[PDB]
């Protein structure tokens with residue numbers, strides 16, 4: 099069983115070291131907190147939170163970094179290396195990369211203004227990476243609500259609260275124009291924009307992402323507070339201002355009878371959202387972990403110990 103006190107004797111300063119690393123990085127890269135939270139999400143949705151996503155290519159298995167959902171998108175890997183090295187210095191061969199990334203995600207959320215809590219610990223590191231599984235398990239922005247629900251259920255998160263609360267991760271961070279071009283100019287082969295996108299916001303987004311423009315250009319997920327972790331993400335949805343299709347469907351999908359009340363409840367109360375976010379985050383962090391003597395304590399998060 100994972101426990102928040104797992105390193106209280108072996109490495110009491112781990113969370114502090116992780117926090118210091120992120121604080122320093124945030125000075126030059128204000129996007130890093132969002133990026134790190136996302137790395138944990140993409141780790142957990144593929145064989146569980148086992149740091150499998152951190153492994154680089156080998157001649158026997160491909161890296162998950164080349165998955166459709168990670169390539170030219172996932173980032174912050176060197177920062178994870180930095181905190182890992184610092185933690186290894188403070189406590190040699192003690193903290194797994196899987197746990198390190200979990201703590202980094204929580205600290206990132208807190209540093210951005212979100213809730214503060216002690217995540218369950220005791221996870222161990224995978225002995226391989228899963229590229230095919232990542233391509234199959236990571237959700238896509240063009241997913242319908244039923245598909246999003248399917249994706250979460252597939253990894254072990256059955257609750258709509260899991261989906262709605264964790265989607266709140268889009269209260270900060272960036273998104274490439276490529277992922278919303280359809281909503282802006284030709285949605286579902288209609289030759290028209292997505293009708294669930296607020297028309298005034300549509301104009302703004304079209305200005306940021308013109309047709310035939312730079313598809314790699316970045317836009318903010320949350321037009322209200324781009325870098326602050328708060329419940330504004332949900333207020334946007336209520337006004338049809340969710341950035342990507344998967345965001346807005348939580349409120350506008352014909353299958354949203356169960357998610358609409360959740361969106362409203364999180365938009366109405368920060369406390370309600372923060373509580374739900376912590377609960378859902380811990381549930382995601384509890385997806386098929388390697389524990390006890392299973393797996394190992396990777397020394398270099400990019401390679402399996404030899």
Ligand code: HEM
Nearest residue numbers: 132133136139171237238239264265267271272273274344
């Ligand atoms: C519900 C399904 C989800 C879909 C389809 C989805 C999709 C996306 C997409 C398309 C991007 C933009 C990537 C890019 O432009 O390179 C992104 C970024 C991001 N997502 Fe998600 N996401 C989902 C769930 C989540 C969850 C569960 C979390 C965390 C709890 C999360 C946190 C983030 C963050 C923080 C960013 C910004 C990363 C950065 O700026 O580096 N996402 N997501």
Ligand SMILES: [Ca+2]
Nearest residue numbers: 141144146150
């Ligand atoms: Ca994983």
Ligand SMILES: [Ca+2]
Nearest residue numbers: 269320323326
């Ligand atoms: Ca925000």
Ligand SMILES: [O]
Nearest residue numbers: 136139140267
């Ligand atoms: O994401």
